[PDB]
């Protein structure tokens, strides 16, 4: 029918096998990116915190290159592959032009990559939504967001996944100049933006900071909880 | 033509390059340096062919740092000699041969310091000490003299200021300008360029 | 396939049916009846002979072009029974592979080599699902120089084996019962009591009396190897001394 | 590039010593049998090879074999090196993407 | 062995002038020590504003006239519009690089108005590399005859002399004495001289007689 | 042409639907995006393999007809390499 | 001057009684300049196996490398440990592959039966030749002093300390009247119950 | 749904590829594969599936596959498609060591055989590979660790987990009885012989029914051995006094 | 796995990507040799079948390498083929026809016959266009009775009653000239033989050792490898028998393997 | 729960994750003629039954007992020409190996090479699986061997097991009669009495098939001493 095959074009004019794809991005977890002033902070909501399981292996977040991270929503193979893929057109990318990847450079990449998945009914697109966030060259922080189709959008901030609309309506309400200026500022929104995606929390924070100039971290539970024990004191005070 | 020089140490390995990057009689370039930084603790001292020495080391370079990227843990210096020699054998071996001279260094956690000598046709030879190069002939000598397996830091230094009076005073080719390295457990320190005025 | 795999267990080559069996391979054998002929071949321990009937449709057409028995090379000859441009195809498809076996192996190809083949690239056919079986049987015949007189059928599935007395199309059952009751009976299996044994057998199966004109006859004997189209004029005798005894 | 220039006359003889022999057999029916005999072989050849392992899998290609008369002749071909062993594969949607033309 | 290149001779000269462009040749094709024929122009007419002339390898010569007329073809089907003389030479310099390796042993000189009216000659060497020049002459003669153009239509050595502009009669006067020049010491020039002035009116073909060898 | 901007946060200069095939040559797209910059890059593509090969610039019409030569390969390629299965869906305004 | 040469090299191996012996030289050098004097030319090719090889250094790795790989695929195929006349033919078809440009190496296998624990000693050429003798089998830039040395020296059902001693006196007296070869020598008895890894004393010119 | 789940990469309306679903079923309908992860080293205790009496055991591990010197796995789902996928790990194994001459971390082989397998589920016309591997190794950067692989091409790295028949029991079980830090390889042996004691409920256990096999660091060398039959029948011996002795004191 | 950017699925077949290492290493400075084998072989179409002989000496250079190396042989149970020339290329040669004529076998159900072998190495040669040197003797009895062929590296052959190959070939031929009969006795052929590859050894210094012999009938096979030994070692007068302690030692490392 | 669309095709797994195809051409495999393979002590014996439709049928023309080597042998049950394809793969295997290592390939090597073609086979979407399984047969390291290769490509060892028409029954057959210690030419006869209790008729020198693996090597017994044991036995 036209919702089967990836090429034909619905009536209307929809390519309804992308929309899936769309659809299988947002059956993932959640992932949230913020923008603020020379900090970059990214923040994934574990869907459970499966016991018996080692959390290195099934991270989230990852790092594209010393100076581009990036993280996804969706089939988890896929973003592997993409991942791969996008470290291998970096490294090739500072071999060829000797200048460090811009993050726009890898966006459209990756979005490159999928709209080509996309294009024939052979290979089907890629079920993940990405969050490419890091430094340009000159240091401007960077916050972008691919799709299946193979669109790429900026954001100031920006949730994908599972309840990304709330976490969209939250970030909106509660963007302002002056958390972008304090990097804790930043930070304490994303655990504040997840804390809303899941009530539970804690343990299930998987937050990264990237600053200027300094690579991927990843900060351990320790301080996820001690930021969280920031949010609910500024919020026990009101 | 172009000169190197590495002294393993204890728990160090001092490399050393000459700055001279020249055409036909004139030097185009005084300040050339030949390091290639692999990885925070592995260092390539690539020279050779004009072309082949860079396109060569930026090869391999980005090679280590995919391997970075993808795994998050840095290649071991014996892994990366090893790798480096498997693709220049390779290359060697088909239509498009490096003629690069090669001296690997790094320092690893567990094993040490390494230096890894390879030469145009990629045959891996680890080494206490080893140097490239025609100056390679007249500085060999001094090291073997005078090198002590137990070498201090600044007396590795002092055998490379030797090794590169003896250059001054008999290779033919002038060779004002060195850049000095070393390579520690706390990753590599780029000390004062050894200079005859 | 290209065009796509067909939906039912029939309607496709490769896929199976419950018990596993390929109808694709029965309906080429359907075909194969469809051709509309009779075929038989007679091994005796002198000359082998193969005998079908020639049935030219319209005056119009030209008789000697009407023809099932093809020479694949100077000593092996075969009939064919099925469809005539697929038995035309594997005819050539024989005769490119026993010349290539004559100029790889310095010797002439024998008969059970050359069915082999056949029957491999027929399991080929049968085994995809772009390509169709062909709908047509293919009898070898020969003499080997240790072996003697050899008849090989050489089927769709890819079945290849020998036989002392074959017969292919139509009334394939009746003249295997006709045959075998004639092997119980162990004759001298003469050349000219071959010849009777099979020009009898398909009068039989298809009760009538032929006339000259309505069969083809090729024979191969030991004495001569070469394959042999029998000439109107000598079926026509060997029929006169059918009718005689 | 050099690589294009052979570095043995016997190198480019033998490296396409399948396609040599295919051609060759082609020619020989075309001159002999016409231009069906080719054609039927090609469509059957595409047929046999458009199904079988991903790239990065070796394939075992029984059908091609017995369709171009090797399987049960061995040459140099055949022991001197095993394509199973390949001792260097790449990306398994690399190759996939390089056979489908797209690289 | 076998020698793809051989050396048939041959001289052509533009000039370029306020409203004309004048492109004059030789009509000797001579093939080592003897003369295939007295009467083979080197300059071909590519449009109604361009005129090429090609010196060298004949077989290369007629290729690339060929290759010259396809592309101009195909410029006009796809662009609907006829290709400009600087397009002209830079598609020839393109042309000419692609076989860069197997050069051609052709020596270009593209000789038309532009755009503006003016006349443009553009020179080329067998590689491809080209520049716009008021006078050219290449082929055999082309040292014999580059001075005398540097010494009249440069006024180059000349001390207090009237830097005067050059007109149609003087270039075709200048034209006809460096070829006569050219015939008296090369023995690859003679036989007659193929005139094509370019002018916004079209294309003018003169022969003139030269002394044969 | 409008930018349609789903959320504040989303950055309006990030939404790009007029580009620059070249300096004097402008395009205005509507439809799916990806295959709009498909065949933005074909074009921009075309118009300096023009100034190259010709040194001069390409004419507007004639970077229409490239674009229109790509934008029609569906079934008809003829070609190995992945083409344009499906037929693009965007539709584009060479203003230049 | 002659590719083997180049990098120089000389490996030899003996047969005992129920014993088996390898020995190679330990000087790596290109042309007439050494680099170091720890060069190592026999590789383990399972616990009573070893192959020795001579020639280009990066031929030599290369050559080890490959042969390990195709050992180690091959001991996880079959899950047993290698005969050394399965390796001595695994070593044929790799250098056969390579036979229009061969690798510059001549290995020698010398090892132990897995099984019945009898020696086995083995050369093989430029391009995969075998040649199994029960006597000894050499290879190297000093063939001769090797070859002449073994004759001279080499008696049927050596005791393996003396079979060692043998071996060592001919290594040793070979590489001291060869240029490109020496700076010491190591030495490998294989035995079923142990195996000796000794290195001797050599002159270092 | 009856839709869907034809070509291998048809995405549903909802987004599911219901093929690597029921491959992963397929796995479901699998023998019990158990691995446990300790301080001491590391286990793998699959169910051996076929008893047959006729049947013969010529190989020395039924299920189990040494992939190289430093790794080993098990499997769980079809034996063919099983068979393919060792012979790749094992050649991407050997290619590593040939590139860095140095055994291949754990984590680089599953992520390879997940990338093939990923890559099979990717492009149609393709069968997705049936099988579930866990892998069982030692390196020189995370030293030991247990890691499961899926027909979609996910892993992840497990301290005591089980594929095949009643996982998610199993599964309940390890997390019942798994002490994180304080399991040693004894007990972690003790621990996999009740979880299949229960899991299997056609009988005790009699060591032909199960397979176990053990990973350790001997004199800084990888050992992976088989445990000998007399071994199980002792470890199930000492597990079923354990359960006589409890019931006993229940009273 | 490999390391990014490979394309291409491996391509099976000789790898002839190393010859500009070659070309390299002898511009720099002037290549190995390989065992040529110095060889002697010949055969013989005697009454009741084929009898073939061989020399066991194997030449690298001028320095004998192998003292005794099996120069005839096996194709078939009744097929065997002599090899002359580069050593590998030869065994490689027979080995690879010997085992595509068991499959023909296999197939067919019948003894191969000597002109198949014929055809197969001769075919290959002229394909490979003589760069494989494999200087050969074919002999057997197949049905059609006894067969002997001379196929050269090139790809010709020639059916004869008596040929040789190899370096020594000529006294080995002369003495077959000199001494053949048409239709000997098994004895009378067996000595011919021996006498030619005898001839080779002695006048020939690329050939020596021992000689080999094949006898071949429709009835039996005959290998005799050790048939003649006409050249031996001499007697050692003096013992330079080293004892323990002679040599001396820097290292020690005991390493006990487990049984 | 028809689930026809899932068993059309190959590569379609069934909502249960059941390979439908898989089952039809084991089912193919279960009708075809019976074949019993018993590895006794001494050797390996591999009897099948040929059902000769007509007595004009040449024995020597074809065989089910074809030797892949000079040491292993194999019968089938299923489709005759994919045996014939896979004997001649499986020949082709052997001498490939051979040639590489130059040692007689095990027995074990080969089925697995053999499964992993039949795995190619059943995975890629196009063509189908082979409707035939092989009961494979040697003698490697002094030690007989007994393989099946299923059309999945899953081998199995057995000591003793039959394929084809009524299987199940001589399975158990073979299970009470089989024994751990049992030579040659007394496993001849349990397969003989296994091929009785699935035949039906009487069998001839030529109704039946015998191929045996011992020491010496792969060897099918000729008509005649088929008759001897089939008196023997009856």
Not at chain 1, 24 to 43: E, F
Not at chain 6, 75 to 96: H, I, K, Q, Y
Not at chain 10, 205 to 224: K, M, Q, S, Y
Request: charged share 25%.
């Amino acid at each position: 029918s036209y919702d089967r095959a990836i090429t034909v074009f619905s009536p209307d004019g929809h390519l309804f096998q992308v929309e899936y794809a769309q659809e299988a991005v947002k059956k993932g977890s959640t992932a949230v990116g913020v923008r603020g002033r020379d900090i970059v902070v990214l923040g994934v909501e574990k869907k459970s915190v499966a016991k018996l399981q080692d959390e290195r292996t099934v991270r989230k977040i990852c790092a594209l290159d010393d100076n581009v991270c990036m993280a996804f929503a969706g089939l988890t193979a896929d973003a592997r592959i993409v991942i791969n893929r996008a470290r291998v057109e970096c490294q090739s990318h500072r071999l060829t032009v000797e200048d460090p990847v811009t993050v726009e450079y890898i966006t459209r990449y990756i979005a490159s990559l999928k709209q080509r998945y996309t294009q024939s009914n052979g290979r089907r697109p890629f079920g993940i939504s990405a969050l490419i966030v890091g430094f340009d060259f000159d240091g401007t922080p960077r916050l972008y967001q691919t799709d299946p189709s193979g669109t790429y959008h900026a954001w100031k901030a920006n949730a994908i996944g599972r309840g990304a609309k709330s976490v969209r309506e939250f970030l909106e309400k509660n963007y302002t100049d002056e958390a972008i200026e304090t990097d804790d500022l930043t930070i304490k929104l994303v655990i504040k933006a997840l804390l809303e995606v899941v009530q539970s929390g804690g343990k299930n924070i998987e937050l990264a900071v990237m600053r200027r100039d300094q690579s991927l971290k990843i900060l351990n539970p320790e301080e996820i909880e001690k930021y969280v024990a920031e949010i609910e004191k500024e919020k026990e005070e009101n | 033509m172009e000169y190197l020089i590495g002294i393993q140490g204890p728990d160090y390995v001092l490399v050393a390059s000459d700055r001279v990057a020249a055409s036909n009689i004139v030097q185009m370039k005084d300040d050339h340096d030949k390091m290639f930084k692999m990885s925070e603790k592995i260092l390539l001292l690539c020279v050779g062919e004009a072309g082949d020495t860079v396109q060569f080391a930026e090869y391999i370079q980005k090679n280590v740092q995919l391997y970075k990227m993808r795994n998050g843990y840095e290649l071991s210096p014996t892994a990366a000699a090893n790798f480096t020699r498997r693709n220049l054998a390779d290359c060697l071996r088909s239509r498009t041969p490096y003629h690069v001279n090669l001296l690997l260094a790094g320092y690893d956690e567990h094993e040490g310091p390494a230096l890894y000598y390879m030469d145009y046709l990629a045959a891996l030879a680890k080494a206490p000490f080893a140097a490239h190069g025609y100056g390679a002939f007249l500085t060999l000598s001094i090291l073997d003299r005078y090198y002590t397996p137990t070498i201090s830091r600044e007396r590795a230094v002092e055998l490379l200021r030797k090794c590169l009076e003896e250059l001054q005073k008999r290779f033919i080719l002038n060779l004002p300008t060195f850049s000095v390295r070393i390579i520690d457990k706390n990753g590599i320190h780029d000390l004062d360029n050894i200079s005859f005025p | 396939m290209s065009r796509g795999s067909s939906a039912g267990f029939d309607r496709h080559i490769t896929i199976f049916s419950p018990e596993g069996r390929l109808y694709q391979v029965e309906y080429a054998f359907k075909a194969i009846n469809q051709g509309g002929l009779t075929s038989v071949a007679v091994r005796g321990k002198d000359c082998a002979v193969i005998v079908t009937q020639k049935k030219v449709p319209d005056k119009l057409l030209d008789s000697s072009t009407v023809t099932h028995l093809f020479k694949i090379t100077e000593n092996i000859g075969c009939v064919m029974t099925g469809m005539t441009a697929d038995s035309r195809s594997q005819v050539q498809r024989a005769r490119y592979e026993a010349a290539n076996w004559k100029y790889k192996y310095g010797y002439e190809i024998p008969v059970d080599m050359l069915c082999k083949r056949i029957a491999d690239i027929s399991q080929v056919y049968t085994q995809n699902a772009e390509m169709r079986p062909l709908g047509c049987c293919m009898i070898l015949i020969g003499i080997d120089e240790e072996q003697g007189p050899q008849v090989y059928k050489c089927d769709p599935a890819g079945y290849y084996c020998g036989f002392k007395a074959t017969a292919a199309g139509v009334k394939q059952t009746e003249s295997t019962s006709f045959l075998e009751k004639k092997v119980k009976k162990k004759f001298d299996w003469t050349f000219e009591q071959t010849v009777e044994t099979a020009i009898t057998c398909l009068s039989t199966v298809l009760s009538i009396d032929f006339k000259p004109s309505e069969i083809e006859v090729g024979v191969v004997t030991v004495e001569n190897p070469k394959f042999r189209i029998l000439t109107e004029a000598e079926i026509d005798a060997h029929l006169v001394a059918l009718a005689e005894r | 590039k050099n690589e294009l220039l052979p570095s043995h006359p016997l190198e480019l003889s033998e490296k396409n010593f399948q396609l040599n022999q295919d051609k060759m057999n082609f020619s020989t029916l075309r001159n002999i049998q016409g231009l069906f005999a080719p054609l039927k072989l090609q469509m059957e050849f595409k047929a046999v090879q458009q199904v079988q392992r991903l790239p990065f899998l070796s394939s075992s290609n029984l059908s091609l074999d017995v369709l171009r008369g090797n399987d049960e002749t061995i040459g140099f071909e055949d022991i001197l090196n095993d394509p199973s062993q390949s001792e260097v594969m790449g990306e398994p949607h690399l190759m996939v993407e390089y056979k489908l033309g797209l690289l | 062995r076998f020698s793809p290149y051989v050396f048939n001779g041959g001289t052509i000269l533009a000039i370029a002038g306020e409203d004309f462009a004048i492109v004059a040749s030789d009509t000797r094709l001579s093939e080592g020590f003897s003369i295939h024929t007295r009467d083979s122009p080197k300059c071909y007419k590519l449009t109604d504003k361009t005129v090429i002339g090609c010196s060298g390898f004949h077989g290369d010569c007629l290729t690339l006239t060929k290759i010259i007329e396809a592309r101009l073809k195909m410029y006009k089907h796809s662009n609907n519009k006829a290709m400009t003389t600087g397009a002209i030479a830079a598609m020839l310099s393109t042309i000419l690089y692609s076989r860069r390796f197997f050069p051609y042993y052709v020596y270009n000189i593209i000789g038309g108005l532009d755009e503006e009216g003016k006349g443009a000659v553009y020179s080329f060497d067998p590689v491809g590399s080209y520049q716009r020049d008021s006078f050219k002459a290449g082929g055999s003669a082309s040292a014999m005859l580059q001075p005398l153009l540097d010494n009249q239509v440069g006024f180059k050595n000349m001390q207090n002399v009237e830097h005067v502009p050059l007109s149609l009669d003087r270039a075709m006067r200048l034209v006809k004495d460096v070829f006569i020049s050219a015939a008296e010491r090369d023995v690859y020039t003679g036989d007659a001289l193929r005139i094509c002035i370019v002018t916004k009116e079209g294309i003018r073909e003169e022969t003139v007689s030269l002394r044969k060898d | 042409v409008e930018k349609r901007i789903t959320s504040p946060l989303m950055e309006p200069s990030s939404i790009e639907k007029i580009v620059e095939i070249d300096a004097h040559i402008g395009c205005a797209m509507s439809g799916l995006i990806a295959d709009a910059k498909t065949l933005i890059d074909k074009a921009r593509v075309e118009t300096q393999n023009h100034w190259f090969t010709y040194n001069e610039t390409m004419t507007v019409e004639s970077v229409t007809q490239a674009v229109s030569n790509l934008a029609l390969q569906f079934g008809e390629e003829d070609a190995d390499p992945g083409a344009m299965s499906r037929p693009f869906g965007v539709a584009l305004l060479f203003g230049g | 001057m002659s590719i083997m040469s180049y990098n120089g090299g000389a490996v030899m191996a003996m047969k005992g009684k129920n014993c088996v012996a390898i020995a190679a030289d330990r000087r790596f050098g290109i042309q007439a300049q050494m680099v170091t004097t720890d060069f190592q030319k026999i590789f383990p090719m399972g616990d009573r196996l070893y192959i020795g090889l001579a020639g280009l250094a990066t031929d030599v790795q290369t050559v080890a490398q490959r042969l390990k790989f195709r050992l180690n695929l091959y001991e996880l195929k079959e899950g047993r440990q290698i005969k050394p006349y399965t390796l001595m033919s695994m070593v044929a078809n790799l250098l056969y592959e390579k036979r229009f440009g061969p690798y510059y190496t001549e290995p020698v296998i010398a090892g132990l039966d897995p099984k019945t624990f009898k020696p086995f000693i083995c050369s093989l050429d430029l391009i995969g030749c075998p040649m199994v003798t029960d006597d000894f089998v050499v290879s190297g830039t000093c063939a001769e002093q090797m070859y002449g040395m073994c004759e001279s020296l080499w008696e049927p059902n050596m005791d393996p300390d003396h079979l060692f001693e043998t071996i060592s006196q001919a290594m040793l007296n070979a590489v001291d009247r060869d240029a490109v070869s020496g700076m010491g020598v190591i030495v490998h008895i294989i035995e079923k119950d142990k195996i000796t890894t000794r290195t001797l004393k050599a002159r270092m010119d | 749904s009856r839709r869907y789940d034809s070509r291998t990469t048809i995405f549903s309306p909802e987004g599911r590829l219901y093929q690597v679903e029921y491959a992963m079923e397929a796995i479901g309908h699998a023998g019990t594969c158990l691995g446990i992860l300790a301080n001491d080293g590391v286990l793998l205790a699959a169910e051996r599936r076929n008893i047959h009496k006729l049947l013969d055991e010529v190989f020395f591990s039924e299920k189990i596959y040494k992939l190289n010197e430093d790794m080993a796995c098990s499997v769980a789902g079809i034996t063919s498609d099983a068979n393919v996928l060792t012979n790749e790990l094992r050649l991407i194994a050997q290619r590593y060591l040939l590139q860095y001459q140095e055994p291949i971390p754990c984590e680089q082989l599953v992520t390879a055989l997940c990338d093939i397998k990923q890559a099979y589920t990717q492009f149609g016309g393709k069968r997705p590979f049936g099988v579930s591997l866990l892998y069982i190794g030692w390196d020189k950067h995370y030293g030991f660790q247990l890691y499961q692989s899926d027909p979609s091409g996910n892993y992840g790295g497990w301290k005591a987990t089980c594929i095949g028949n009643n996982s998610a029991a199993a599964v309940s079980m390890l997390k019942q009885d798994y002490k994180e830090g304080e399991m040693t390889l004894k007990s972690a042996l003790a621990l996999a012989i009740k979880v299949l004691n229960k899991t299997m409920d056609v009988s005790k256990l009699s060591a032909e029914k199960v397979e176990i096999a053990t990973l350790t660091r001997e004199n800084g060398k990888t050992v992976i051995r088989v445990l000998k039959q007399k071994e199980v029948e002792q470890l199930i011996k000492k597990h079923e006094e354990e359960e006589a002795k409890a019931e006993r004191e229940k009273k | 796995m490999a390391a990014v950017s490979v394309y291409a699925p491996p391509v099976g077949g000789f790898s002839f990507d190393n010859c500009r290492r070659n070309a390299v290493l002898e511009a720099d400075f002037a290549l190995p040799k390989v065992r040529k084998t110095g060889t002697t072989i010949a055969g013989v179409v005697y009454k009741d079948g084929i009898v073939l002989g061989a020399d066991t000496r194997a030449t690298e250079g001028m320095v004998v390498a192998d003292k005794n190396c099996s120069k005839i042989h096996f194709i078939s149970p009744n097929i065997y083929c002599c090899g002359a020339g580069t050593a590998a290329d030869t065994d490689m040669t027979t080995q690879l026809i010997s085992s595509n004529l068991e499959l023909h076998s296999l197939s067919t159900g019948r003894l191969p016959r000597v002109v198949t072998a014929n055809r197969m190495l001769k075919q290959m040669l002229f394909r490979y266009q003589g760069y494989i040197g494999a200087a050969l003797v074919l002999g057997g009895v197949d049905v059609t009775g006894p067969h002997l062929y001379s196929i050269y590296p090139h790809g010709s052959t020639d059916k004869l009653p008596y040929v040789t190959m190899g370096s020594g070939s000529l006294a080995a031929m002369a003495v077959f000239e000199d001494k053949f009969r048409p239709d000997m006795e098994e004895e009378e052929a067996k000595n011919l033989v021996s006498e030619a590859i005898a001839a080779g050894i002695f006048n020939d210094l690329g050939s020596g050792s021992n000689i080999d012999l094949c006898v071949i009938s429709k009835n039996k096979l005959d290998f005799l490898r050790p048939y003649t030994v006409p050249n031996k070692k001499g007697t050692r007068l003096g013992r330079y028998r080293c004892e323990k302690g002679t040599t001396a030692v820097l290292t020690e490392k005991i390493t006990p393997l487990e049984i | 729960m028809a689930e026809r669309g899932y068993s059309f095709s190959l590569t379609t797994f069934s909502p249960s994750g059941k390979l439908v195809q898989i089952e039809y051409a084991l089912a193919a495999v279960a009708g075809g003629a019976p074949s019993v393979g018993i590895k006794a002590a001494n050797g390996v014996v591999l009897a099948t039954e040929k059902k000769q439709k007509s007595i004009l049928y040449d024995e020597r023309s074809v065989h089910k007992v074809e030797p892949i080597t000079k040491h292993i042998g194999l019968v089938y049950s299923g489709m005759g020409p994919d045996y014939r394809v896979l004997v001649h793969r499986a020949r082709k295997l052997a001498q490939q190996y051979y040639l590489v290592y130059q040692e007689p390939i095990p027995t074990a090597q080969l089925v697995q090479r053999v499964a992993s073609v039949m795995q190619e086979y059943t995975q890629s979407g196009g063509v189908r699986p082979f409707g035939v399984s092989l009961l494979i047969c040697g003698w490697n390291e002094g030690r007989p061997y007994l393989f099946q290769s299923d059309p999945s490509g899953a081998y199995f060892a057995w000591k003793a097991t039959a394929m084809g028409k009524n299987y199940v029954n001589g399975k158990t057959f073979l299970e009470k009669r089989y024994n751990e210690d049992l030579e040659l030419e007394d496993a001849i006869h349990t397969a003989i009495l296994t091929l009785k209790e699935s035949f039906e008729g009487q069998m001839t020198e030529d109704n039946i098939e015998v191929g045996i693996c011992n020491e010496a090597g792969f060897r099918r017994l000729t008509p005649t001493e088929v008759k001897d044991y089939l008196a023997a036995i009856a």
